[PDB]
From a paper:
Human multidrug resistance protein 5 ([name]) effluxes anticancer and antivirus drugs, driving multidrug resistance. To uncover the mechanism of [name], we determine six distinct cryo-EM structures, revealing an autoinhibitory N-terminal peptide that must dissociate to permit subsequent substrate recruitment. Human [name] was demonstrated to play a critical function in regulating cellular cyclic GMP (cGMP) homeostasis, which is essential for many physiological processes, including the maintenance of vascular smooth muscle tone and cardiac contractility. [name] also influences signaling transduction pathways and may contribute to drug resistance in anticancer and antivirus therapy. From a clinical oncology perspective, [name] can directly contribute to cancer drug resistance through the efflux of many anticancer drugs, such as methotrexate, cisplatin, purine analogs, pyrimidine analogs, doxorubicin, and antifolates from cells.
The following single-particle reconstruction with cryoSPARC36 yielded a 2.9 Å [name] map. Overall, [name] displayed features typical of a nucleotide-free inward-open conformation; its height and width were ~140 Å and ~95 Å, respectively. In addition to those of the well-solved transmembrane and NBD regions, an unexpected EM density was discovered in the central cavity of the TMDs near the cytosolic leaflet. This unassigned density was peptide-sized and -shaped. Based on the features of the auto-blocked EM density and the Met1-Thr94 peptide side chains, we were able to build an atomic model of the peptide trapped in the [name] binding pocket (see more details in the method session). This peptide spanning from Cys46 to Ser64, referred to as C46-S64, was well fitted into the EM density. In the pocket, C46-S64 adopted a coiled, serpentine structure with its side chains facing the cytosol. The first group consisted of hydrophobic amino acids, including Trp240 (TM2), Tyr244 (TM2), Phe288 (TM3), Val293 (TM3), Phe452 (TM6), Phe988 (TM9), Met992 (TM9), Phe1091 (TM11), and Phe1145 (TM12), which applied hydrophobic forces on the peptide. The second interaction group was composed of charged residues, including Arg286 (TM3), Glu289 (TM3), Arg344 (TM4), Lys448 (TM6), Lys455 (TM6), Arg985 (TM9), Lys1040 (TM10), Arg1096 (TM11), Arg1148 (TM12) and Glu1152 (TM12). Notably, mass spectrometry analysis of purified wt-[name] verified Ser60 is phosphorylated (P-Ser60), allowing P-Ser60 to contact Arg1040 and Arg1148 through charge interactions. Accordingly, Glu289, Lys1040, and Arg1096 may form salt bridges with Arg55, P-Ser60, and Glu57 of the C46-S64 peptide, respectively.
Residue numbers in the entry:
A (entry chain B): 46 to 64
B (entry chain A): 94 to 501, 573 to 786, 840 to 1437
Amino acid sequence: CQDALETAARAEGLSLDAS
Amino acid sequence: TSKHQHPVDNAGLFSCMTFSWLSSLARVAHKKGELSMEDVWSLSKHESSDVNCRRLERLWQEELNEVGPDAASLRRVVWIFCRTRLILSIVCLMITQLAGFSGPAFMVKHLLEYTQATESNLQYSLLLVLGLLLTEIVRSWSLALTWALNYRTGVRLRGAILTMAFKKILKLKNIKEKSLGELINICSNDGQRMFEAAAVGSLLAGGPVVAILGMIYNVIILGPTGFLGSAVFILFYPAMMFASRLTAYFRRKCVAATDERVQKMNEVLTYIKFIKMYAWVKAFSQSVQKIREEERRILEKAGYFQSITVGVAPIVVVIASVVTFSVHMTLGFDLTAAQAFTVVTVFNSMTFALKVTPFSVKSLSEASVAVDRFKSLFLMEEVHMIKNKPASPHIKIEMKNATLAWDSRLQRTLHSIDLEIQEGKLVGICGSVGSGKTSLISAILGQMTLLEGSIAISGTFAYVAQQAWILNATLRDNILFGKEYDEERYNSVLNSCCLRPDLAILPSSDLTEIGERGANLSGGQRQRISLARALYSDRSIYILDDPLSALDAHVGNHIFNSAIRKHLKSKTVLFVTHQLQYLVDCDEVIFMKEGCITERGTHEELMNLNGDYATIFNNLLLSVPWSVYGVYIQAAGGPLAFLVIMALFMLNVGSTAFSTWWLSYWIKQGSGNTTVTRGNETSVSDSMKDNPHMQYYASIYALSMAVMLILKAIRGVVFVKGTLRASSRLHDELFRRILRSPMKFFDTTPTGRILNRFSKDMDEVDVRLPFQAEMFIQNVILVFFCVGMIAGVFPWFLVAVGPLVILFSVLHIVSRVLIRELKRLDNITQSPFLSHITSSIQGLATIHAYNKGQEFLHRYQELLDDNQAPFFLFTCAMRWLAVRLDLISIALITTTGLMIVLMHGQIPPAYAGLAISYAVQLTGLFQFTVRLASETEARFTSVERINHYIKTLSLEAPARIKNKAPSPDWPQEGEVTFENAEMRYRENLPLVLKKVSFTIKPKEKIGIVGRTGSGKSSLGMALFRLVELSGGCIKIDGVRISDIGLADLRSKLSIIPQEPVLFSGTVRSNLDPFNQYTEDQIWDALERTHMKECIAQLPLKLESEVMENGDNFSVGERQLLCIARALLRHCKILILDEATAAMDTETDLLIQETIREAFADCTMLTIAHRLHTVLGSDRIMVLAQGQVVEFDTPSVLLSNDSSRFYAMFAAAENKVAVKG
């Protein structure tokens, strides 16, 4: 699903939605 | 989209690494308050779809012709595509990592070892602060440049690969080999995978290197004890990987639990009327409660592991520091403030980089999967188009003893085809199913392969498929199909296909938007529109495969005569049909039999030959307010739960802070004024190993680490429990209000909205809101603790902080009015893109037959660019905000360093090291804070919707009426009386019951028959009090049902619905979900309805699994089960409502006689429209638009010619007798 490690690196400049 | 040159093209290095063009756009957005699609800039020429697609296609073609299409690597091609820009990004990322390491390590080491000196030099300390500032600026701006390069690289890759995918898709032979959702996901999501892969993997190849640098530096500073801090990260990060795996494992089971709950909720909402009239609310409530509690347990486990893996970076730093320094000092080594806090700062930098890395690994894995899918797509077999021209221009289609085969390997279906078609000859194709007509059509189109012979062809094709692909556009746009407009020709075409009734029915027919498959149109209208498109297209050859099958015979023949025998007498038409009565007027007839040509010629010759064509010929003749947050807090347990959760959050972060402060305190103590012998003389020695109480400090350090871990665990458990309690309270209250609202709610509101509140609003709150809330609160408390530590060391740090708080607020406002208005523009331009993708994939055969494979590609490219511009601006705005918040953080660190150097001799070096460590820790926490605040705001919008429904729903009648229980034997008989019955479903609607009065004696079989809307469907509704009366009274045996409780009213009445209602579970659940009867009664009922043999034969007779709607029994079995359920209640009065729906004759007789004999001693209210079935009953009741005119025995009504019931009986007899 959505992790707190993926979100921390993805909230650095990417959108917060994998889908 | 409006620009001459994109501002990224006219931007220097400074603007590229600071994004000042997006600063101008942000200014515009903030001033206006919103953004429109005209305020954004068009795609640059460099990121345009066509040029990138050409580059990618060339690179792929070189790979194909060097290695071959069995050992080709699309990963290699994507590499070569991105190579130079990825190399530049890696160089910039190496610069970022080097600066990020050099700042803390060298700068903080020298800064803290200057504070340990005895003499003050003011021209060296300021140089150190300048170096720190410059290093922070360099790392921030180099990371910005890395992101700027990666964004453009990913956008170009996405555009190129999506354009290539659509190019390939538009020329696929086996359209149905891949799925349709798969083909959509190829052109929709895989491009996003490639973009994220490019950017975030380009980030990836910079992560572990600074970790190695930090490990080496820690070893250099300390000794063999730096490996202790090194091993902590090694043991720690696989642990968080395992935690992620466990969280995913549990969330996979939560998916099944949620699916079960949503399926049961759909059952509850779809058949709520049946549940109400059966008083079955409690059973479904209990079932949903059971599913909800099991789902809640799975959610608890998943949330526990999630919280385990939430905020570990300060935890990593503290664990590494505690292990390193405890084992350092218990072995007799020495330690100073500079060494220890340089090591802590290096730990912080390592945690930063390793926070970056893992999602990069994940993104590259998803990229590998997507590249595998793309390579699978690009190697599929392409469709061709026959180009071998014939000899004579007079010939338009010509084969010669050809034998063609399908492809699934070659599947032979055509053998020795000798076909010759001259211009102007209307040909018809005849045969049986599978004879090879569609095979011939596909071979002529170009989907088949040749084995022997030759195929000749000349001209262009129109195409009317058997499914009549309708284009997702206006009705006039999908009749032009890219052609120029002409008035008279369009009008003649429209009159030829009989579209005037269609033009009248539709509100804006000539301008109506039509769906991809057809939303407000019928099959015949679809055929007519496809035919109109074909005739307007004006091509040389027409392929009309069964164009008038679904169309009616009258209009079909009309169109045939008016157009095919009139318009296309001068063109070639390929008529394929199953109705062979149309070929009597055709010029040439073709019959196919088993793929071999047997007989053909003229109609009279076929009649004379008496062939198989003659045999079939004779056969056919015969932003949320504070109110939402307050509501959520109140659901969570009120102010006390919020205070407890906040207290535990502060306890966790303060345990980390206390660990760091205790390190600083232990270093500050020193030796504690102990004189020791160092030779021939004794003197005081300031070394931490000479402190007699050093083991005490080390023990408290280890205790600090353990207490921090314990507090983290407690915080996680309590937060998960509280958030799930809030969500469960919301769900329970919503369900309770739903199960107790009148049918007016369920009638004026679609079940889709209510399920959406249950399906995805509940899922959203449950999983998403606790996660984002936890991350946000952890980050905010960490920021507050860092600021508080630096301020407890330096209050003028607060003095400097104030203005930076103002700047942070301004930045948040500006970057929230901009990033949200670019998010919306991103997905507004995606809807046309997805619609075009679906419409194209659903009509590939028609597109290929019309040779319109380039116009659709051009439209795809236009929509892709329109989507790509705002998405690029969105990502660049993310990095714009990141750069500015990094500037704020750099200001904070520079202020801390300046205070450290301006207070030399007045602050202990340990406290200065603590302050500088927290100042460095402040890096990167602001972007996370802003983004998480926005995310939690969205989740609370979801909570707002849920609470709106919770506090909106109205109330039904109370379960028990104060008027009291009627009797312990009511009803004693079956006498029901009506008088002045007034009834209306809603307000301002016409009354359906207008002064209706009748009496029914017990045991009478009364069949209510009438016209649609006469009020026949309201007798059951008014008898069950689903809608309250507006006048008059209903009386049973002298008892007025207006004064009896709903439970006591519905508990003694039974009803057999029009369609059988069967819920998921077991037969026992669908027959007696309260377990009130004995086995003997159930089996007697089953044998009464002739069901004992069919049930006992099953291995689990009374426990057998029942599927949704009972799609494991035949229709007769389902009706028998429903009558058995009704019979199990033993009710004196029952309502049977027209149980005939496409039923076989003997089953109908069996069910009719079963109902006749089963309810012999019960009053029967048969609501049916089939007059022949109601004959033989006691009295016939006919309703006339809410009023009764005739009510007596059928014998005295059929004997009177003036009787209306006799008139409708005669009409029904004429309808049955005349077919004709």
